[PDB]
Amino acid sequence: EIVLTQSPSSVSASVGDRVTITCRATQGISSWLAWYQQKPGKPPKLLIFGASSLQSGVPSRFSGSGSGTDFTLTISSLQPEDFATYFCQQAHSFPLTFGGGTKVEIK
Amino acid sequence: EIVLTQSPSSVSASVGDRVTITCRATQGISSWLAWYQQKPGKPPKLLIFGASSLQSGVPSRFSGSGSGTDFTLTISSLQPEDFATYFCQQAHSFPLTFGGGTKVEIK
Amino acid sequence: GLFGAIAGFIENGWQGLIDGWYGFRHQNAEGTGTAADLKSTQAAIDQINGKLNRLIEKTNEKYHQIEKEFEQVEGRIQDLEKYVEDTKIDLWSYNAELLVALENQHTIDVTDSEMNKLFERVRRQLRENAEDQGNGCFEIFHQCDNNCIESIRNGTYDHNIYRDEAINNRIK
Amino acid sequence: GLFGAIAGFIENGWQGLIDGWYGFRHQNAEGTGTAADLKSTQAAIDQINGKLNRLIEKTNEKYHQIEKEFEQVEGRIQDLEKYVEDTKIDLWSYNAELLVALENQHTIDVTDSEMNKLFERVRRQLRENAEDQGNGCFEIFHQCDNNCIESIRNGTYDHNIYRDEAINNRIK
Amino acid sequence: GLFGAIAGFIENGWQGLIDGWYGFRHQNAEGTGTAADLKSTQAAIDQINGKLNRLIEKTNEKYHQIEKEFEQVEGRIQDLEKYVEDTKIDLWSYNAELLVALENQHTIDVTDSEMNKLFERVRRQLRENAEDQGNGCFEIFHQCDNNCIESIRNGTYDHNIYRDEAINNRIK
Amino acid sequence: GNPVICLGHHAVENGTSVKTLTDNHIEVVSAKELVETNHINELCPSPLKLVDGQDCDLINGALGSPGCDHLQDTTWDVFIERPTAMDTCYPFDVPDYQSLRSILASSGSLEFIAEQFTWNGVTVDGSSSACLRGGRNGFFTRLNWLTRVKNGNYGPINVTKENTGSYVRLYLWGVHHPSSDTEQTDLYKVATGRVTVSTRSDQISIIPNIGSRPRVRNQSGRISIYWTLVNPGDSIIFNSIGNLIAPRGHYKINKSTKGTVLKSDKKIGSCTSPCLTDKGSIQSDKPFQNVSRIAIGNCPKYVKQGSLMLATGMRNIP
Amino acid sequence: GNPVICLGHHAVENGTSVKTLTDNHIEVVSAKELVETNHINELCPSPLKLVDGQDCDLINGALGSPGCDHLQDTTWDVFIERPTAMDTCYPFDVPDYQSLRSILASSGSLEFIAEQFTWNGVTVDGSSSACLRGGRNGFFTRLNWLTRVKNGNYGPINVTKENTGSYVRLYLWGVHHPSSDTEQTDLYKVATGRVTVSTRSDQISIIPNIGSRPRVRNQSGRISIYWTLVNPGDSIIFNSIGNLIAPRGHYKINKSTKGTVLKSDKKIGSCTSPCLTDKGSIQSDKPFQNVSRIAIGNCPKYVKQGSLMLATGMRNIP
Amino acid sequence: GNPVICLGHHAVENGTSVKTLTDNHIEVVSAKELVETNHINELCPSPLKLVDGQDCDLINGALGSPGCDHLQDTTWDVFIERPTAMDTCYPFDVPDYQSLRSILASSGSLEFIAEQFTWNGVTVDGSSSACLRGGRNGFFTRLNWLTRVKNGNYGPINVTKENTGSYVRLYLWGVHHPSSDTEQTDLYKVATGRVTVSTRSDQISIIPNIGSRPRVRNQSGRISIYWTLVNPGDSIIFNSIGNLIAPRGHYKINKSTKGTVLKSDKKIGSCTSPCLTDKGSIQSDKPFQNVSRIAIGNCPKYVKQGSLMLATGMRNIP
Amino acid sequence: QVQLVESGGGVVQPGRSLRLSCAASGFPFSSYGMHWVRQAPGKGLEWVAGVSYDGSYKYYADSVKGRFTISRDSSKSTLYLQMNSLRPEDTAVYYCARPSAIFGIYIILNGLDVWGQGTTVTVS
Amino acid sequence: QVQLVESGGGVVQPGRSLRLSCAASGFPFSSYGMHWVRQAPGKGLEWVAGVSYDGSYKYYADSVKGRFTISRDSSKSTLYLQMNSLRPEDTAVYYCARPSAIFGIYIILNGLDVWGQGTTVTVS
Ligand SMILES: *[C@@H]1O[C@H](CO)[C@@H](O[C@@H]2O[C@H](CO)[C@@H](O)[C@H](O)[C@H]2NC(C)=O)[C@H](O)[C@H]1NC(C)=O
Ligand SMILES: *[C@@H]1O[C@H](CO)[C@@H](O[C@@H]2O[C@H](CO)[C@@H](O)[C@H](O)[C@H]2NC(C)=O)[C@H](O)[C@H]1NC(C)=O
Ligand SMILES: *[C@@H]1O[C@H](CO)[C@@H](O[C@@H]2O[C@H](CO)[C@@H](O)[C@H](O)[C@H]2NC(C)=O)[C@H](O)[C@H]1NC(C)=O
Ligand SMILES: *[C@@H]1O[C@H](CO)[C@@H](O[C@@H]2O[C@H](CO)[C@@H](O)[C@H](O)[C@H]2NC(C)=O)[C@H](O)[C@H]1NC(C)=O
């Protein structure tokens, strides 16, 4: 398989902080990474595809980076509705892998 | 074999002259020429490898040119220490050929 | 293209191929079917996305500049302020025109390469058991059921299995 | 070249070829002859003319400019008017030097490709009735008179016609 | 790469190969060994050096210029002198960024080509006496002692010598 | 009937045309447009801090003409001059007008640091019917019109100010050019005035010029506005025997750092865009644009072409 | 004796050398030169409309100096200044000479809209032996030398002209700098003259200085030439108590639109070329050129190289 | 067990990363850096001829202020102004200061061609306690302070000098702005001076203005420095009835030809480099650099990137 | 407009079977491949099943191979997840998800655009 | 730092043998191929011998083929030039030379970076 490793596993921050999250796999998954937002009890929403391409309708503060080996999800100016658990997705080959979840709490 | 023909065989010039020397072979040796400086009784010092690439530490006034058929060694501003005999080297395929020598006397 | 597969010995494309950029299309005893190829499709998209991301990096951000519109003739200074802007716009327009034309010439050659890459991979797989008909199809000189077809498409096909049948059917 | 046909496994060119850019040269029982190949020659010429027409589009038309020659030292303003023009000329001269060198590198590769394109086509035609000598020539293992030769040059050659004769002459 | 030899059907590179960029690695009765190939290695270096020498030609020599640092705000004239310099730096920075990105795409394509050039040369040498395993290796269907191996590496291998032996070992 | 396996590539019914090195019209499966051609038609007030003078150009705002009361102490990333801006005060010209408006626009601040001067031997706070503030004779809010003592002399002014702060001070002053020798003597009692403002490193001196100018706001005279910068440690001296238009303080020279002026007529909306143009804001991720050569912010590079299609797919051959 | 079919490519005896990314000297079959290096040595009068001053520079033509009678009411796409151009009238300087030349050249028109002024209280039509028009004391055809009433005063001038037309009026006037206190009082009777020209938005006033300058055409005095633009709706006022060199009308500000001036000495032929240089016209379809940086019209882009060979054929290997 | 011959390529343990058209991070075998990021921190005196003013800026050296005795008859390829440069003479300003500096720096020469003038009717060689040369009242080494004849008149000056030579002459002169009407009459006896310097084509006249400026070296007055060029065949005339600061000769207009000025504080070493920057010299064979935009000589082109890796090898796959 | 509706989630005993369904709306369902992804309650998302557009190529996770069976229907535009041999390991909130279309191809292997509401499967 | 020391040059008679040596210092000798180049006294440089990095492939000039023998030691990092069947034609000032290294690899066929001091071989 391909094993994803999200860091950190959780973080608390106030509104307006520069949040950084990492997705971290084994194989060369080129640029196939998909970041997701998830509120409790709700299905995910695609935030970033192609590891950098902003999804249509998603605010410009969400940004993705990385290539091949090291991946990163950065949020510039966090907002109250941005409190959620975040998952990254491998999409280079089957089977599809996800991460351990990176939740943003209130500080 | 590959025969090198250096023209002219010798030349006299004053300090500051635009000196021109040619190395001239038979086969396609496109970029494999090496120009050497030689003082009497001393071993050579590689001046130009690749027929244009300046050797590390050699002053920028030494310049090489040519590709494949017609080669040339140009010196812009001659200096008193530059009085020496100059040899070109074929490096396409064995055996290694050298020229007849182009000395720079005093005028 | 430089390899002459797309718009070359591959006559035309397949509009029924909707799940990939490159695919297989077979005819065995059991019937016929089409499947996309992931590796070739992914390699092409990665190189297109890769050059797409390179072209979007937001690097141009200027605030205080020179005036570019004038409500009265002034002469020397205005002539220069105009000539400077005109010079810049022309150079950037060239930088853009050359960029698009060049990237496209490379893009079309990359896709033509990945098509030939896939074909050359399958050629090396069978490697005495089939022959290049020319149109991008291989005449497989042995019975190849759907499990055998899938073995060619997922890269597990062992040519030694059918080598005895295939050579005999070819030579005689 | 990137394909190594021209200045590669094709030793040198044919000056007798005066009716095209690529051609056939055969030796059958009846004799020997040379004939150009239109398709390959046209594809090369159209891609050279296609990039020739792109480089001629007249787009540079300026009348009022800044002065580029001066009969007296003036200082600050003249320094700028000169430095602006110098900066432009440098950037265009680079735009020109890179354009030529790059279009040539591509041009030589396109022609090398079109040569390899033609060779690959004929290779796919005979199939198992000929072998690659290496020098760009195919050893045809059967009797191929001039009508058979023309069938190879206009793309009508049927390999299934001489398959029995050819395989037998190769294997034994 | 465009040919898919390097980072393609050639799985990985050889760190033990220190005397060249491309080489042979054999397994015969007498043992195993690795030797570099000069021609392929020489061609690749020539084209890299050839493009390195082009990128070093010292052509930028200016002495009197415009002021690029100011100790007091002045307005119109300073706004222009700053805008002119900024516009220049932007264009050269793009020229450099594009040049490197393009010369690298070509460099990696050239080396990928030269690896395929060597493979295709050997393929045409044996030419019925060996089969393409797929990983860049040729299964030679006849005895090939070290002298026979060297004859493949220096281009003196005569296929007609082992043709009877090889075809027999392949077909049966 | 031997099994056959074919290899191919996808295609679509209607492809897109792109340019290459060797052809003007090549149909590919998919393509993206790189030249943005659309704008919002409104100026987005985010993230760039905008300021609307909206009846006052920048210089009129700096001087403090009647309409520009709302511009006081404003700070901006982009000042916005309107085409409907109008002069409202005593008629004035500014030698090197575009330089002093490009100093005020770069600094990005109309914070006026008020100072107390002691103009010894002159009347102060003069006003004119050509400069009305609420149907009443007024003047530039940042300038002090000095005339002779009532029925007396124009006591020679030799006022100085030392720059003690750490910033560079921008002083705005002026020189009155009367219309007739009567007005000159009626106002400053000298036949010929003189205004000499100076620092230790740079100076400027003006002797006014009497004569008729076209009537502007029923006034035939003019005021030539000048400006002097003072570096930390330096001192400025206002020396005049007549016709001085005195300052009421100075402005603070700030750092350019996205500070400029944009001459547009579009309304300020409620959108968000990091790029402004004279024709409105640009919202795009495209590298180039044909909207306007006037572009402020994180903008696409202006080109002449209206469409540059980048190929994002293989050759389409149905 | 198996039949063999070979595949190859054409070659020639003498190929052409081109540059690539990896070699300075590669012989290909054919190649086209991209840098034009040849010019006609004559200036083609088509399709661009040319005007030859041929003894008169542009400014001398605008003022109307003796030689420039043939330049009246001329229109051009390109004006041509010769090196053999000579001053022919009273010695004069022009503050910001280059700008006035640029303003006239870009307008592309010497159409002088004549006007009737009423200079009340002066003698008119003065002439100087330094400015001869047919062995007779003359003056600039577009300027009116005003001196004091014969044995009388220099009655003050307060003339105004409103801009009624839709265009921008360029007024050319001047100030006389006499050579001695005698001349100033001999001519305008004031010890110190004054010239004040003004509009509603921009003004200029000059008080003339007396003194010796090097003798030019046996004249020690000078005339400083100035210009004032008047927008539609605006009015210009000529106020002067002495030394005014009055206008006789204005010039019409036109649109740049291929309007400029070229300094060359090459004759005007009968050829046809859409590109002019100081060294002559360029007739080419090539993209680049090393003829001259000075290039007006649809011209190849000036570069520093003399030869850039584009490969139009395969590698030539005999 | 058939013999097998394999074909491959070389690799290394740790490869370098380079950018391509389709990727930001591709590991290749070997790569060369194209951006130079290091400088010597010393200015190399070869092969470019340098001149260190080291307490004198270029203009103070041209005028001949006390500290600049060592700059006389110096010639350079690059003049080096220091940040520690200090005025040492009477306080002075220069209208269009930046241009005179650029004109001097481009000529690359401070060779002063001395001339003998006959200033009839004035005292010569005036000095000032603001300009000390060895604890003694001095003046600019290239300027002559003229004052009225002892207890007499400022006999009018009408001196002329013809340019016989083949070169263009640069004359450096000035105008004294006094601090009080006492000083103006104590020195030149005229209530209002006048300075008129002229050639046959261009001219300039200045009437000095009296008033208080901030005390510099215990002096309230100022001297405005001007310059006049004289082409071969032309003649220059210094006409003044008061406040003239006369020249002692002229400088020779030379050819730009690697002649300029560099503002740096780095010491001049003994190294050798054909490229100078404000931060020091650059010794490189790389095409680009991020050291400084200020680069004089055969320099790499300044770019914004700090690293541009050119791939000099194949793809590295261990 | 466009969304995916899920159903079939209930309380079930280990060893038995269930069938969950995903009805599409607002897009060309038979043009896309589709995926089932399960969020184990407490843990993160866990891909379980996926099918091609035609339904000939089916991809399963190693934990459910030979145990679950995916299928689809063009006539009803519905996605079927037939689960056999259930056990409390399979207890999860099931999501039917849609892989994103890229360039012009409707690839099966990409990020997932549209999700269903989430139907919970409880195994006691 | 880096330099090559030569030794072995002496006065010898025609027909007999000699051995010259070139000890390397300051670089990975066993990684490079090496050359012997002789400057015939009066004439220019003449390449005589050259060996690969491992010592399996040895290249000789046509004048000395089957007469001289080159070798190299990794344990001692020394280059041996064993001369047999000498004659006054072989009289020369002998130089051990190191072919230059290029971007990645240590090619045997290039210009020669480092030379020895030059040890003279006289054959009376
Ligand atoms: C930017 O370029 C576009 C074309 O690429 C210009 O627009 C079009 O104008 C033509 C007429 O010449 C119409 O037929 C098209 O329908 C227009 N298309 C669009 C999308 O506008 C456009 O005007 C240019 N913008 C500017 C400011 O010049
Ligand atoms: C334009 O470039 C050409 C070179 O391409 C210049 O000319 C040549 O000059 C050399 C000597 O340097 C002669 O040997 C050639 O015969 C010349 N050829 C031609 C066609 O002139 C030419 O001088 C350049 N022109 C300008 C105006 O710079
Ligand atoms: C005008 O004002 C200035 C300062 O207000 C006067 O000058 C000062 O004189 C003292 C004498 O002790 C010096 O120490 C100061 O340095 C001077 N100030 C400056 C700014 O230079 C000046 O004298 C006044 N002018 C007149 C004519 O009285
Ligand atoms: C030139 O570019 C280099 C980077 O390519 C700049 O320096 C480095 O700065 C980073 C901090 O961001 C350090 O971690 C590195 O160690 C630095 N490396 C080197 C080689 O300096 C450098 O500052 C730039 N120089 C200028 C003048 O802008």
DSSP A41-79: TS--EEEEETTTEEPTTS-TTEEEEEETTEEEEEESS--
A40 close contact with I: CB closer than 8 A = no
Å from CA of F306 to ligand 1 middle: 7
Taking the C-alpha atoms of residue G245 and residue G187, their distance in angstroms, rounded to an integer, is 12
By the 8 A CB rule, do J106 and J32 touch?
A: yes
| Cα within 13 Å of Cα(J3), Cβ side | 7
Tell me the angle at which helices E38-54 and E76-126 cross, rounded to the nearest 10 degrees: 170
Which amino acid, one-letter code, is at A46? L
- Which residues of chain H lie closer than 8 angstroms to A68, CB-CB? 25
Q: Which of E58, E63, E65 to substitute to test the interface with D, most D CBs within 10 Å?
A: E65
Strands H309-311 and J3-7: unpaired
H315 close contact with E: CB closer than 8 A = yes
Identify any residues that bridge with H113 across adjacent strands, giving them in sequence order.
Answer: H250
Residues with Cβ within 8 Å of residue E86, at least 6 apart in sequence? C62
Four-residue CA torsion sign, F18, F19, F21, F24: positive
Q: What domains, with CATH codes, occur in chain A?
A: 10-106 (2.60.40.10)
DSSP string over chain F: ---EEEEEEB--SS-EEE--SS-S-EEES-EEE-EE----SSB--BSS-EEE-SS--HHHHHHT-GGGGGGTT-B-SEEEE-TT----SS-EE-TTHHHHHHHHHHHTB--EEE-----TTSB----EEEEESSSSEE--TTEEE-B--TTS--PPEEEEEE--SSS-EEEEEEEEE-SSHHHHHHHHSSSS-EEEEE-SS-EEEE---------BTTB--EEEEEEEEE-TT-EEEEEEEE-EEEESEEEE----SS-EEEE----B-S-B-SEEETTEE-----SEE-S-S-EEEE-PEE-S-S--EEE-S-B---
Tell me the best of H177, H184, H220, H222 to mutate to test the pocket of ligand 3, counting ligand atoms within 8 Å of each CB and taking the most: H220
* Backbone angle region of H249, left / alpha / beta, with phi > 0 → left and psi within -120 to 50 → alpha: left
Q: State whether residue J57 is helix, strand or coil.
A: coil
Residue D76 is nearest to which of H102, H229, H231, comparing CB atoms?
A: H102
Chains near F (3 or more Cβ pairs under 8 Å):
C, D, E, G, H, I
Q: Kindly report the number of other CB atoms within 10 A of residue F13's CB atom.
A: 7
Residues with Cβ within 8 Å of residue D48, at least 6 apart in sequence? D107, D110, F22, G312, G313
**Residue H211: which of G118, F210, E138, F160 has the closest Cα?**
F160
Q: Kindly report the number of other CB atoms within 10 A of residue D29's CB atom.
A: 10
Give the strand order in the sheet containing G275-277.
D61-62, G295-298, G275-277, G280-281
Taking the C-alpha atoms of residue G68 and residue F148, their distance in angstroms, rounded to an integer, is 53
* Nearest Cα residue in chain E from D87: E88
Which amino acid, one-letter code, is at C22? Y
Taking the C-alpha atoms of residue E37 and residue E24, their distance in angstroms, rounded to an integer, is 7
Give the closest-approach CA distance of E111 to chain H in angstroms: 5
Domain locations in chain I as residue ranges: 3-123
Taking the C-alpha atoms of residue C104 and residue F314, their distance in angstroms, rounded to an integer, is 10
* Backbone angle region of G64, left / alpha / beta, with phi > 0 → left and psi within -120 to 50 → alpha: left
DSSP string over chain H: ---EEEEEEB--SSPEEE--SS-S-EEES-EEE-EE----SSB--BSSPEEE-SS--HHHHHHT-GGGGGGTT-B-SEEEE-TT----SS-EE-TTHHHHHHHHHHHTB--EEE-----TTEE----EEEEESSSSEE--TTEEE-EE-TTS----EEEEEE--SSS-EEEEEEEEE-SSHHHHHHHT--SS-EEEEE-SS-EEEE---------SSS---EEEEEEEEE-TT-EEEEEEEE-EEEESEEEE----SS-EEEE----B-S-B-SEEETTEE-----SEE-S-S-EEEE-PEE-S-S--EEE-S-B---
Cis peptide upstream of residue H274 (ω within 30 degrees of 0): no
| E strand segments, I1-124 | 3-7, 11-12, 18-25, 34-39, 45-51, 58-60, 68-73, 78-83, 92-99, 112-115, 119-123
* Alpha carbon nearest to ligand 2 atom 1, residue: G306
Length, in residues, of chain D: 172
Cis peptide upstream of residue H208 (ω within 30 degrees of 0): no
**Residue F201: which of C155, I120, H85 has the closest Cα?**
H85
Residues of E with CB under 8 A from a CB of B: 38, 42, 46, 49-50, 52-53, 56, 58
Taking the C-alpha atoms of residue F291 and residue F34, their distance in angstroms, rounded to an integer, is 13
Maximum C-alpha span of chain H: 124
By the 8 A CB rule, do I104 and F29 touch?
A: yes
Smallest-distance ligand from the CA of H179? 3
Which tokens belong to E86? 């900024």
Taking the C-alpha atoms of residue A97 and residue A2, their distance in angstroms, rounded to an integer, is 7
The alpha carbon of F152 is separated from its chain's Cα centroid by a whole number of angstroms, namely 41
| Residue with the two structure tokens 């106030």 | A14
Residue J30, classified by CB atoms within 10 Å of its CB into exposed (0-12), middle (13-18) or buried (19+), is middle
Determine the straight-line distance between the first and last CA of chain A, rounded to whole angstroms.
36
By the 8 A CB rule, do G184 and G233 touch?
A: no
- D 2-41 near G (Cβ less than 8 A): 6-7, 10, 12-15, 17-18, 20-29, 36
Experimental approach taken: X-ray
* Nearest Cα residue in chain H from J105: H10
G8 close contact with D: CB closer than 8 A = yes
Top CATH class of F50-261 equals alpha beta
By the 8 A CB rule, do F264 and F242 touch?
A: no
Taking the C-alpha atoms of residue F25 and residue F311, their distance in angstroms, rounded to an integer, is 12
**Residue G241: which of G188, G179, G172, G184 has the closest Cα?**
G188
- Give the DSSP H or E segment for D53: helix D38-54
Residue A86, classified by CB atoms within 10 Å of its CB into exposed (0-12), middle (13-18) or buried (19+), is buried
Rg of the Cα trace of chain D?
A: 27
Which tokens belong to J18? 């000699």
- D22-171 to CATH, choices 3.90.20.10, 3.30.565.10, 3.40.50.10860, 3.40.50.1820: 3.90.20.10
A87 close contact with I: CB closer than 8 A = yes
| E strand segments, chain C | 22-27, 32-36, 61-62, 130-132, 137-140
Chains near D (3 or more Cβ pairs under 8 Å):
C, E, F, G, H
- Cα pseudo-dihedral G98, G100, G102, G104, rounded to 10: -150
Taking the C-alpha atoms of residue H299 and residue H281, their distance in angstroms, rounded to an integer, is 9
Cis peptide upstream of residue H83 (ω within 30 degrees of 0): no
Å from CA of G89 to ligand 4 middle: 65
- Which residues of chain H lie closer than 8 angstroms to C110, CB-CB? 22
Q: Which atom belonging to ligand 1 lies closest to the Cα atom of F307?
A: 5
Taking the C-alpha atoms of residue G50 and residue F232, their distance in angstroms, rounded to an integer, is 57
Which amino acid, one-letter code, is at F272? T
Domain locations in chain C as residue ranges: 22-171
Q: State whether residue I84 is helix, strand or coil.
A: coil
* Alpha carbon nearest to ligand 3 atom 2, residue: F158
* Nearest Cα residue in chain H from F205: H209
Q: Do chains A and G touch (3 or more CB pairs under 8 A)?
A: no
Strands H235-242 and H244-247: unpaired
Taking the C-alpha atoms of residue A76 and residue F47, their distance in angstroms, rounded to an integer, is 13
* Backbone angle region of H233, left / alpha / beta, with phi > 0 → left and psi within -120 to 50 → alpha: left
Identify any residues that bridge with F204 across adjacent strands, giving them in sequence order.
Answer: F197
- Which residues of chain I lie closer than 8 angstroms to A87, CB-CB? 44-45
Taking the C-alpha atoms of residue C104 and residue F32, their distance in angstroms, rounded to an integer, is 11
Residue E23, classified by CB atoms within 10 Å of its CB into exposed (0-12), middle (13-18) or buried (19+), is buried
Give the closest-approach CA distance of H307 to chain E in angstroms: 10
State this model's resolution in angstroms: 3.4
Taking the C-alpha atoms of residue E21 and residue F55, their distance in angstroms, rounded to an integer, is 73
By the 8 A CB rule, do D20 and D112 touch?
A: no
**Chain pair D-E, CB pairs under 8 angstroms:** 54
Q: J3-123 architecture in CATH?
A: Sandwich (2.60)
Taking the C-alpha atoms of residue C7 and residue H150, their distance in angstroms, rounded to an integer, is 102
Four-residue CA torsion sign, H27, H31, H34, H37: positive
| E strand segments, B1-107 | 10-13, 19-24, 33-38, 45-49, 53-54, 62-67, 70-75, 85-90, 102-106
Question: Over I58-83, what HEC string results?
Answer: EEECCCCCCCEEEEEECCCCEEEEEE
Cis peptide upstream of residue B8 (ω within 30 degrees of 0): yes
Taking the C-alpha atoms of residue F123 and residue F147, their distance in angstroms, rounded to an integer, is 5
